[PDB]
Write a protein that binds this ligand. Structure first.
Ligand SMILES: CO/N=C(\C(=O)N[C@@H]1C(=O)N2C(C(=O)O)=C(CSc3nc(=O)c(=O)[nH]n3C)CS[C@H]12)c1csc(N)n1
Ligand SMILES: CO/N=C(\C(=O)N[C@@H]1C(=O)N2C(C(=O)O)=C(CSc3nc(=O)c(=O)[nH]n3C)CS[C@H]12)c1csc(N)n1
Ligand SMILES: CO/N=C(\C(=O)N[C@@H]1C(=O)N2C(C(=O)O)=C(CSc3nc(=O)c(=O)[nH]n3C)CS[C@H]12)c1csc(N)n1
Ligand SMILES: CO/N=C(\C(=O)N[C@@H]1C(=O)N2C(C(=O)O)=C(CSc3nc(=O)c(=O)[nH]n3C)CS[C@H]12)c1csc(N)n1
Lengths: 265, 265, 265, 265
C-alpha cells in the first residue's frame, strides 16, 4: 500500500516518481519504479567526486585547475567567483557536491580524462561499483536535456541507491576519502526542500540533489534514524508530460520522503 | 500494515500504544487502540482551560487567584514561584498548558466549582462536547497514579482526539477564546520529543503532553501539513506491565508520529 | 559605574540588592553591598545538602526517612507526594535543591542532628568552609520571616558566594559527591526567571533560589562562559521597606544578572 | 569603561569592532568606532528590501521574476533552486534577508532600476533616509571583497543603526510594509551566533547579518527588552590585518552584544 501512496503523489504532481531504499537487516527494500531509467542531472556529481578520490593520492586535491569564463556552463555559484584565481581539485569537489557547481563537475570530469570529456571514465567508475545500468554521456549542461526515453545520462533509483550505499556506508573508498565525501554531502546547501524536508529534524540527512528540464528533480540521500540506523534513499522524478519547460516540483520529493520516513520509523 | 508497524513499536518499547487521527475529506481515520482507555495525565489540562474559557467571559482571565503553600502538592513550576504574588486565571491557563503546572490545574478545576473540587464539572464539560467515554475523578497529583485497568481519570485516543478537534478546529469556543487556547498549546514547552519530534519541521504542531507513572506518556496535537491542512493526532501509551516505576518512552510517541506523518504526507 | 547601574535597579524595583562575584585570574571581583546581611531563605538548602553529603558515606543516601503530614510545612511539592511512602535521604537532597522543598530541608537538617533541629550543626558546617558570618537559626518556614536587621538566618552575598565556590569549583567535597550536588543544581526547576534569565542561553547556569517575606528574593549560581570559564554569582535582594507582604521581584535578579554578564563577557 | 571592554574584545579576537546603539529617552548612546567605515557585506539587504517595499505597492511582491543560470554568481541558497520556476519579488525579499541569498539581492537591485544595476538607486534611498555616509558601489559578490580602507560598499555603525531604526521603529515604511520587513528579519536563519547569542533568551532579537573576506562579520538588530523596550544594535567587525582569508569571529559579536545588554539591562 506504499505504491498506492506514491502513485497518489504522481497523480497530485503529474509526475513520474522513482523511489528506492535498499533492504537492511530489519527493513525490506522500498521499490517504486526502482528500475526505470531517470536522468542523473546533478546527482552524478556525488559519485563523480568519489571517482576523483578513488584514483588519486589525495595530494591531488591541492592541484590547481585554471579555467576561463568560456568554461562556465550551467549553474556554477562557486566557479563564477574564481575565473581569475583558479580552483584546486578539492575546491572543485567541495563546489560540485555542496553547491552543485556545474563547471566544477566538468573540470572534475576532464580530470578523469578520456573520450567524451571524462564521461566514459565516469561510467567505467560506476561499473567498478557493480552498476551496469547507469551511464554518463554529456557534460554540464547538456546532460540535463536528454528527451524522455533517451537512455543517455540516466541511472535508476535502484542503481544509484546501491552506488551511494557503497560510497558512504560500504567500502568503495578508504576511510580517509570516505570521510571527505560524507562531510561534503552532509554540508550540502541545495537539498533543504527535498528529502531533508520530508524527514523529521532528528534524523540526519546527507544528500545530493539533481535538477533538469522535463521537470526533473532528484535527491539521493543517506539518512540516519535517531538511533543511528542508516538508510539510503534515492528519490527521482520527472514531469515529461509537460515538455522541456516542465517545472521541477521539490514538494513531490519532500512528500515522497515523508512517506518513506513512515515506513522506516 | 500501519497496525503491523504499531504492533512492532509496541514490541520494541514494551508498551501499549493508542493512536487516533480523525478522518478528513481526503484521508481515512487512523485507529490503533483508538477505543481502549489510557490515563489522561496532563492531557486533560487542554480541555480544562477550554472549560474555564467556555463558561466565563474573557474578562475572567484577569481575576487574581491567591493560594497558599499548602496548595503546592504537585509539580508546579510556575505556581510555586507565585504563592506570595498570586496568579491570574490567564496565567494559570498559560501555566497549566505550557508548563503542565499541577497547582495551576487544581486552581482551574476549583474555578469550575462543584463536587469533587471541579472534577465533576470538568467531566460534564467533556460530556457536553459529545465525549461519552472520558472521566476525571481526582485532582493533581493523584490522577496520574490510578493503577492499570482502573477506569478513573482515563480517556481514549478516539475521545480526546474528537474533543481536541472541536476545541481547535471546530466551534466549541468563540474565535477569541479559541485563539487563546491555540496559542498556549502552540507555545508549549513540554512536547519537543513527542509528536513534534516525529513530524518534519515544516509541519506545524501544537500539543499538550501527559506523563505519569506506569510508563504513561501521551501527546495530543493539532498538526498542519506544509500546505496548511490540519489533522488531529492523539497518541497515548503506557508501560503498565512494567509496574508503577516503569519509565515512559518518549521515542515511542515520536516514532508513532512519524508513522502517522507518512500516511498523511 | 557598575554600582550606578545596580543602584538604579534598586531605584527601579525599590529594593536592596546585594551582588557578589568572586575575583578570578582574568576578572576583578564584583561587589555591591556584598558584605551586608541578607536572609538565606532557601539558598541555605544548597550548602545543607553539601553538609549532609560531607558527613556521610554515599550509602547514607538510601536511608529511608518517614514523616507525617504534620511535618509538612512550607512549600514542599515533593514531600507532599510521599507522606505515605517516606523518602530516602537522596530524594530529600534532590527535592531540597531542585524543588526547594521545605519539608525536605527540615528533614535534612534533622539528619545533621543537634540543637535547634540541626541549625547549629549546619552553621558549624559553614564555619568548616571558612564562612564565619552566616548563620542558620530556624527551620522552614520561620527562617524566611525574620524582621529586617535581625542577624538570624542571614548570610551575605560575599560569604555565600565563596561558600558555593568551594562546594562546586573547589574541593570541599570529593569528586563523587561534588558531582551529585552539581547535577542537582544544574537541574533546578525554580530558577528559570532569576540568574538564568539574565545570562545568554549559551552560558551554562546552575543555581539555587531563595524566596521569603519582606520581598526577599535570592539566587546563587555558578555560571560557565561559552568557552567554559566558571564564575560564582550571588544575587540577593529584599524589599523590606514595603513590609512583610512586599512581593519579591524576580525581574530585579534577572536584570542584575544581565549587568553581571556584561562585565564578564 | 565600556570602551575599555570593547578594546579588550578587539585585542582578544585580533579584530576591529564597531558598535552603535542609538540613544533613547532613558539610555545614552553607545558608541565604539561608531563613525568608522566597515563593509556592508549582506547587511545592506535589509534596507534593500525596504527600498523595494517603499517605492512599490504591496501587490508588486507577487510579480514573477525569471532569471537564468548565468545570474547565479554568488551564494544563493534559494535562487539556485528556482532558475526553472522563477521567484516572486516577495520570495526574493524573503530570500535576500532570511538566507542572505546573493542572487535575490541582485535581482532586487535590478528591480530598483537605474545606473549600476540598482546600486545608485539603493544608495539614493539611503540618502533619502538621511544617511549621507553609506554607499553601495557593487553587486553580489564583489561588494564583499573590497580591500580594507576602500570606501566603496561601506557604512558606519552609526549610519546603519539610524537607517534600521527608521525602518523598523520609525515611519520610513507604512505599517503593512514595516511588518513584512520586521517579520523577515525576525525569522532570519543566519544570526543565531551573533547578537542573538549575546542577549538573554527573553529579549526579542531581529537581525540581518553580513559576512565577508578580511574576517568581516556584521550584525544589525532591533532588540526588545523583556519589558518590550526596543533598541537598535549595530555591531560590525573585520580582521583585515589578517588578510583576505582571515576568518570571521562570530563570538566577538556575541560578546560585544553581551556587553551592550549589560548596559541596557
Ligand atoms: C547547509 O546550507 N545552508 C546554507 C547555505 O547555503 N550555506 C552555505 C555554506 O555551506 N556556506 C559556506 C561554506 O561553503 O562554508 C559559507 C562560506 S562562503 C565563502 N567562504 C569562504 O571561505 C570564502 O572564501 N568565500 N566564500 C564565498 C557561508 S554560508 C554558505 C544556509 C544559508 S543561510 C542558512 N541559515 N543556511
Ligand atoms: C503525579 O504525577 N506524576 C507525574 C506528573 O507530575 N505528571 C504531570 C504530567 O502529565 N506532566 C508532564 C506532561 O505534561 O507530560 C510533564 C512532562 S514534561 C518533561 N519534563 C522533563 O524533565 C523532561 O525531560 N521531558 N519532559 C517532556 C511534567 S510532570 C507533569 C509524573 C511525571 S513522570 C512520572 N513517572 N510521574
Ligand atoms: C528545568 O526545569 N524545567 C522544568 C521542570 O520543572 N521540570 C521538572 C523536572 O526536572 N521534573 C521531573 C524530574 O524531577 O525529573 C519530572 C519527573 S517528576 C516524577 N518522576 C517520577 O519518576 C515519579 O515517580 N513521580 N514524579 C512526580 C518531570 S518535569 C519536572 C520544566 C517544566 S515544563 C518543561 N519543559 N520543563
Ligand atoms: C564574495 O563573498 N563572500 C562571502 C559572501 O558571499 N558573503 C555573504 C554574507 O554577508 N553572507 C552571510 C550573511 O548574511 O552574514 C553569510 C553568513 S551565514 C552562515 N554561514 C555559514 O558558514 C554557516 O555555516 N551558517 N550560516 C548561517 C553566508 S555568506 C553571505 C563570504 C562569506 S564567508 C566569507 N569569508 N566570504
Amino acid at each position: 500500500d506504499l505504491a498506492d501512496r506514491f502513485a497518489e503523489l504522481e497523480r497530485r504532481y503529474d509526475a513520474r516518481l522513482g523511489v528506492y531504499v535498499p533492504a537492511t537487516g530489519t527493513t525490506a527494500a522500498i521499490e517504486y519504479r526502482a528500475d526505470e531509467r531517470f536522468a542523473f542531472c546533478s546527482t552524478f556529481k556525488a559519485p563523480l567526486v568519489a571517482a576523483v578520490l578513488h584514483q588519486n593520492p589525495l595530494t591531488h586535491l591541492d592541484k590547481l585547475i585554471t579555467y576561463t569564463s568560456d568554461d562556465i556552463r550551467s549553474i556554477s555559484p562557486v566557479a563564477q567567483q574564481h575565473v581569475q584565481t583558479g580552483m584546486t581539485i578539492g575546491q572543485l569537489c567541495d563546489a560540485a557536491i555542496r553547491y552543485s557547481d556545474g563547471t566544477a563537475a566538468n573540470l572534475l570530469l576532464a580530470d578523469l580524462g578520456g573520450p567524451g570529456g571524462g564521461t566514459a571514465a565516469f561510467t567505467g567508475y560506476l561499473r567498478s561499483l557493480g552498476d551496469t545500468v547507469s551511464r554518463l554521456d554529456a557534460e554540464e549542461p547538456e546532460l540535463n536535456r536528454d528527451p524522455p526515453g533517451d537512455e543517455r545520462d540516466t541511472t535508476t533509483p535502484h542503481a544509484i541507491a546501491l552506488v551511494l550505499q557503497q560510497l558512504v556506508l560500504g567500502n568503495a573508498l578508504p576511510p580517509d576519502k570516505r570521510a571527505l565525501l560524507t562531510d561534503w554531502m552532509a554540508r550540502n546547501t541545495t537539498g533543504a526542500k527535498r528529502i531533508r524536508a520530508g524527514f523529521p529534524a532528528d534524523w540526519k540527512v546527507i544528500d545530493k540533489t539533481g535538477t533538469g528540464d522535463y521537470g526533473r528533480a532528484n535527491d539521493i540521500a543517506v539518512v540516519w534514524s535517531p538511533t543511528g540506523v542508516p538508510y539510503v534513499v534515492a528519490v527521482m522524478s520527472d514531469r515529461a508530460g509537460g515538455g522541456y519547460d516542465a517545472e521541477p516540483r521539490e514538494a513531490l520529493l519532500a512528500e515522497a520522503a515523508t512517506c518513506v520516513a513512515g515506513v522506516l520509523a
